[PDB]
Scaffold this active site. Structure first.
Site, mmCIF file in Angstrom:
data_model
loop_
_atom_site.group_PDB
_atom_site.id
_atom_site.type_symbol
_atom_site.label_atom_id
_atom_site.label_comp_id
_atom_site.label_asym_id
_atom_site.label_seq_id
_atom_site.Cartn_x
_atom_site.Cartn_y
_atom_site.Cartn_z
ATOM 1 N N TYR A 19 80.470 87.193 28.924
ATOM 2 C CA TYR A 19 79.387 86.629 29.723
ATOM 3 C C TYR A 19 78.728 85.438 29.031
ATOM 4 O O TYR A 19 78.668 84.345 29.586
ATOM 5 C CB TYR A 19 78.325 87.707 29.991
ATOM 6 C CG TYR A 19 77.127 87.259 30.814
ATOM 7 C CD1 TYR A 19 75.970 88.044 30.866
ATOM 8 C CD2 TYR A 19 77.148 86.064 31.551
ATOM 9 C CE1 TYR A 19 74.854 87.652 31.628
ATOM 10 C CE2 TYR A 19 76.040 85.662 32.314
ATOM 11 C CZ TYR A 19 74.897 86.461 32.346
ATOM 12 O OH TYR A 19 73.792 86.074 33.076
ATOM 13 N N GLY A 31 91.551 85.159 25.290
ATOM 14 C CA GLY A 31 91.082 86.369 24.630
ATOM 15 C C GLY A 31 91.918 87.609 24.878
ATOM 16 O O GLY A 31 91.608 88.419 25.733
ATOM 17 N N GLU A 77 93.301 83.763 21.112
ATOM 18 C CA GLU A 77 92.261 84.675 20.643
ATOM 19 C C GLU A 77 91.550 84.093 19.426
ATOM 20 O O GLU A 77 92.178 83.708 18.444
ATOM 21 C CB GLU A 77 92.880 86.041 20.307
ATOM 22 C CG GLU A 77 91.932 87.027 19.649
ATOM 23 C CD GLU A 77 90.760 87.400 20.527
ATOM 24 O OE1 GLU A 77 90.982 87.984 21.604
ATOM 25 O OE2 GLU A 77 89.611 87.112 20.145
ATOM 26 N N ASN A 136 89.776 87.778 30.832
ATOM 27 C CA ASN A 136 88.725 88.758 31.046
ATOM 28 C C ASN A 136 87.680 88.276 30.060
ATOM 29 O O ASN A 136 87.496 88.880 29.013
ATOM 30 C CB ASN A 136 89.211 90.142 30.642
ATOM 31 C CG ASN A 136 88.156 91.189 30.826
ATOM 32 O OD1 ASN A 136 87.051 90.885 31.269
ATOM 33 N ND2 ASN A 136 88.479 92.429 30.495
ATOM 34 N N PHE A 174 85.331 99.075 31.563
ATOM 35 C CA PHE A 174 85.043 98.404 30.291
ATOM 36 C C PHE A 174 84.486 99.336 29.205
ATOM 37 O O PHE A 174 83.986 100.427 29.492
ATOM 38 C CB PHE A 174 83.981 97.323 30.496
ATOM 39 C CG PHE A 174 84.421 96.144 31.295
ATOM 40 C CD1 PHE A 174 84.984 95.044 30.669
ATOM 41 C CD2 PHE A 174 84.184 96.090 32.665
ATOM 42 C CE1 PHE A 174 85.287 93.904 31.385
ATOM 43 C CE2 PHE A 174 84.489 94.948 33.393
ATOM 44 C CZ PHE A 174 85.042 93.850 32.746
HETATM 45 N N1 LIG Z 1 85.420 81.355 22.243
HETATM 46 C C1 LIG Z 1 86.450 82.209 22.315
HETATM 47 N N2 LIG Z 1 87.696 81.680 22.208
HETATM 48 C C2 LIG Z 1 88.756 82.541 22.277
HETATM 49 N N3 LIG Z 1 88.640 83.873 22.450
HETATM 50 C C3 LIG Z 1 87.374 84.384 22.552
HETATM 51 C C4 LIG Z 1 86.217 83.553 22.490
HETATM 52 N N4 LIG Z 1 85.088 84.335 22.623
HETATM 53 C C5 LIG Z 1 85.575 85.591 22.766
HETATM 54 N N5 LIG Z 1 86.932 85.681 22.726
HETATM 55 C C6 LIG Z 1 87.810 86.870 22.847
HETATM 56 O O1 LIG Z 1 88.009 87.187 24.208
HETATM 57 C C7 LIG Z 1 88.032 88.586 24.403
HETATM 58 C C8 LIG Z 1 87.014 89.030 25.471
HETATM 59 C C9 LIG Z 1 87.281 90.431 26.077
HETATM 60 N N6 LIG Z 1 86.268 90.655 27.096
HETATM 61 C C10 LIG Z 1 88.698 90.651 26.650
HETATM 62 C C11 LIG Z 1 89.670 91.399 25.706
HETATM 63 C C12 LIG Z 1 90.936 91.994 26.389
HETATM 64 N N7 LIG Z 1 91.765 91.034 27.110
HETATM 65 C C13 LIG Z 1 90.605 93.015 27.462
HETATM 66 O O2 LIG Z 1 89.977 92.672 28.450
HETATM 67 O O3 LIG Z 1 90.963 94.166 27.312
HETATM 68 C C14 LIG Z 1 87.820 89.223 23.032
HETATM 69 O O4 LIG Z 1 89.064 89.624 22.428
HETATM 70 C C15 LIG Z 1 87.191 88.106 22.210
HETATM 71 O O5 LIG Z 1 87.592 88.216 20.840
#
Ligand SMILES: Nc1ncnc2c1ncn2[C@@H]1O[C@H](C[C@@H](N)CC[C@H](N)C(=O)O)[C@@H](O)[C@H]1O
Length: 236
Positions: A96, A30, A51, A93, A155
């Site tokens: 939940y 992600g 992603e 990152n 966050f």
């Molecule tokens: N099942 C999934 N497979 C791949 N990516 C996902 C999935 N579920 C959520 N995400 C992505 O994972 C990221 C979760 C975020 N908390 C992290 C974003 C970024 N790296 C940051 O922390 O600034 C988002 O961009 C979601 O689009």
């Protein structure tokens, strides 16, 4: 419902604890706006960003313009097929709602020797709690350690609780492939305190004294293995 950490000042603080080097290939779970991704590419040998959201794959790419050691696959981490003949590490990152499914996917359906994840503080505490089945299945494959606390202010949207940066290190599995099912059944039966389904009244006492378990509400993973092993002995 997806959050992000976009303050470079904060990202650097977190990279401080992440020991990834120039020669490691990394799979990030992600990319989001690409904030952690921007640092990994400079930090590591090559980054394969996974992603799910397609618009974010774009943003990740705009972010990484002046860089080449990466690729952005618009796939679902849960459906991803990792390499089975390569040395790679993982960072993420993660959300939940699917933490359990992601961690299980990358620890059981991947061979990354080192995994770095940011999860909710409580959920991190649970991964180390020998009273829950997840922690128990996980400890047979990796060593789990909490490196630091990630304040929710880091966050946005600002979550209701803090988070922790954790590290999963691969180790020679403690559970043979043969004992795959026995261990699974035993883990489930034990966490649910269904003792009689796995130990008679005496096998249970000897097993605890053998493993040196005084407080049955606080046992080490090492002690639990002892229990599992005694369990194997008693049943052919
Ligand atoms: N099942 C999934 N497979 C791949 N990516 C996902 C999935 N579920 C959520 N995400 C992505 O994972 C990221 C979760 C975020 N908390 C992290 C974003 C970024 N790296 C940051 O922390 O600034 C988002 O961009 C979601 O689009």
């Amino acid at each position: 419902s997806q959050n992000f950490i976009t303050s470079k000042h904060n990202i650097d603080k977190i990279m401080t604890n992440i020991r990834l080097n120039e020669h490691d290939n990394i799979f990030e779970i992600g990319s989001g706006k690409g904030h952690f991704t921007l640092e990994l590419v400079q930090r590591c040998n090559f980054v394969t960003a996974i992603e799910i959201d397609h618009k974010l794959c774009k943003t990740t790419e705009n972010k990484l313009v002046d860089h080449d050691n990466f690729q952005v696959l618009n796939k679902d981490i849960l459906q991803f097929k990792f390499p089975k003949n390569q040395s790679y590490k993982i960072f993420g990152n993660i959300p939940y709602n699917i933490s359990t499914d992601i961690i299980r996917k990358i620890v059981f359906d991947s061979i990354a020797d080192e995994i770095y994840l940011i999860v909710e503080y409580g959920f991190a505490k649970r991964l180390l709690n020998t009273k829950r089945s997840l922690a128990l299945f996980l400890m047979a494959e990796v060593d789990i350690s909490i490196l630091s606390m990630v304040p929710r202010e880091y966050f946005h949207p600002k979550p209701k609780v803090n988070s922790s940066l954790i590290r999963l290190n691969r180790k020679k599995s403690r559970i043979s492939h043969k004992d795959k099912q026995k261990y699974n059944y035993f883990v489930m039966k034990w966490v649910n305190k269904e003792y009689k389904k796995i130990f008679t009244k005496n096998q249970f006492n000897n097993s605890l004294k053998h493993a040196g378990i005084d407080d049955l509400n606080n046992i080490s993973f090492e002690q639990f293995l002892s229990l599992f092993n005694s369990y194997k002995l008693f049943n052919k």
